[PDB]
Amino acid sequence: GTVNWSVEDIVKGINSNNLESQLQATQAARKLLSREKQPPIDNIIRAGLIPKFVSFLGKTDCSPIQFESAWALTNIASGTSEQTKAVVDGGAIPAFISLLASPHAHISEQAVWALGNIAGDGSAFRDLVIKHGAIDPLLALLAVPDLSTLACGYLRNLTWTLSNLCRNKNPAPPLDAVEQILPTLVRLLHHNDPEVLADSCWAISYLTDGPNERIEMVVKKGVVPQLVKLLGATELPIVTPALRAIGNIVTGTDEQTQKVIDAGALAVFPSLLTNPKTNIQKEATWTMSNITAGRQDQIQQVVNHGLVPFLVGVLSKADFKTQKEAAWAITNYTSGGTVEQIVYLVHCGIIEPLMNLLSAKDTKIIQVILDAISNIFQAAEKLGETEKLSIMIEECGGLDKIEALQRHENESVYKASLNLIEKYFS
């Protein structure tokens, strides 16, 4: 019936003055745009069909053509920025927002989806969707006593679109828009559907990626314990954004970081730091590095939770990206830690894997490692143990590695290493 129409036929139907013919042709367009491979989005755009689809959105008297054009426009908007722009340029934004009030759940849902694609394109369209007043009617769709009464797919689409309104930076979303959205987000974060949880965590992760003021507005909503709970979920699609959000939060103030610790987050890290997915290990190690950049009492928590041997572990063997984060965690630890905490570090076996990493071509990690080594010597100086450390670095091949670095290209590298040698290795 409406399967596999040429664009030409679609145009002919839509240009006819017969609403049924238009409906038929519009559905045909929807099916082209929904096919598995290479939807002919540009061809549809060039045929000049967008203004017609947009006008069909306003036809309250013919709900099916509203649905079909909503669906077609949604899929056009799912493409490149230029393709999304064509949809916006046609006046689709306010028309879609008007459809959020539709008595037909399947039409309202489709409009939710479309606005998600538009906002998803980037900051400008995101903020334009907000300026057109999308937030109030979107939130109103979620104003029910129990989210469980909503159709599952419907709730998922709502959550996803809301997460796109929280997404992107340069600039980040308007503060008042974030305040307006947050209480619903907190609520979605306690829902029991895995996809709603995943997308809610993504939204929280976007919101906490920025200046400490941004983190604060999320953290004061009391979501950290729930985020930590989700950190221990069995679904990787939940753990991943939950962990990204926890990582973002510990980039904040000592107080913001302490909330993460207080909520029991550190107890999950033996699993995270040995997680089969390398991206989880990397994010988790990055997180640890920002925690070891914290207060001495926060470093002590890392110690108490038995996490230092886990850091020695990733420093010893992990993908290179994770190893670099491990190196950072060590330099941060030795910069902020007490002498005793630093001594503990050496006793866990940090020295050997630390030295082995000096074979890395990465110039930045070499700097990180040399610094850490400097910091550890400074602690051994307070204890008069400098020579015990020199010998330790000597026997694992470290001194050989420091020696060569004297001839390294980078200025601070050979300078840092020359200092080490002519000081502790003479």
């Binding site: 998600g116 980037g122 990582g247």
Partner: peptide, 23 residues
Amino acid sequence: RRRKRKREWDDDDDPPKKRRRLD
């Protein structure tokens, strides 16, 4: 004592910006 290190930009693990409805 060092400063915190904010997230460095990247879209790799990041989920899709947009969704096309197939059915």
